[PDB]
Fold Phosphotidylinositol phosphatase PTPRQ.
Amino acid sequence: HMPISKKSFLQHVEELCTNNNLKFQEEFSELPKFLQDLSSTDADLPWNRAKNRFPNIKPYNNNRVKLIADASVPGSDYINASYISGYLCPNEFIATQGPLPGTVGDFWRMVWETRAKTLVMLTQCCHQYWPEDNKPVTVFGDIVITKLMEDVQIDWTIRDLKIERHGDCMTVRQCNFTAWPEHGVPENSAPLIHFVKLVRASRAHDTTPMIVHSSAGVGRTGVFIALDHLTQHINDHDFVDIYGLVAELRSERMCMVQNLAQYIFLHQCILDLL
Ligand SMILES: [Cl-]
């Protein structure tokens, strides 16, 4: 196993595609779904199981996002969310599922406690966890959310939200990509790549994470985080290692880049960029 040079990349992909994606499938089937010997037992505890949309998609104990715990309430520290490294720093991202109705409060508690100023939503539209224009204030525990603005563009919608607790407050920008097809991957890579760049340009200049979500927090979320890595990488280097990147992402959250179509789409994006 080795990274692939930019000059060799198209030939590499052509070889993977031949004989009905024979080698693409072989390769993708080589990647285990999860890392052997990293526990995910916290996510399997009885008091946490209803906080997971899919019983087979769980964060690892070591890098799950831990909410402030109440010692008298088991599971008060739990959300199905994982820290994921970015290209320039560890813990740049949190990969999470879109909240379940019963974990909306937990989701906003995560936003508050991590001081996250940017959310990336890859679905439409799956529970709306932000206020409606006609009911623009919502309350979860001691956290209050106020919708401040909405900006609907062709391939995404931007929403600014105020979050407050005990009078302290923060503004959070939600970047909601709206151009992902109901089935399969985007036919055209350009809108998603533009969205990746837009999100990065909007980010807070502090060490706080960006929260990225999709239904399971692994498929579309994995593609988005992988593209944010790959787009930066190819500006600094003349080789690319999508296989190794996915193996690293899976070492931080099981099943990141969940299916062969998503894996192939990452290669198509690189082809389009070169
Ligand atoms: Cl979602």
Notes: DSSP finds seven helices and ten strands in the chain. The two ends are 22 Å apart (CA to CA). The first strand starts at residue 4 and ends at 5. Residues 98, 121, 123, 126, 213-215 surround chloride ion (CB under 6 Å).
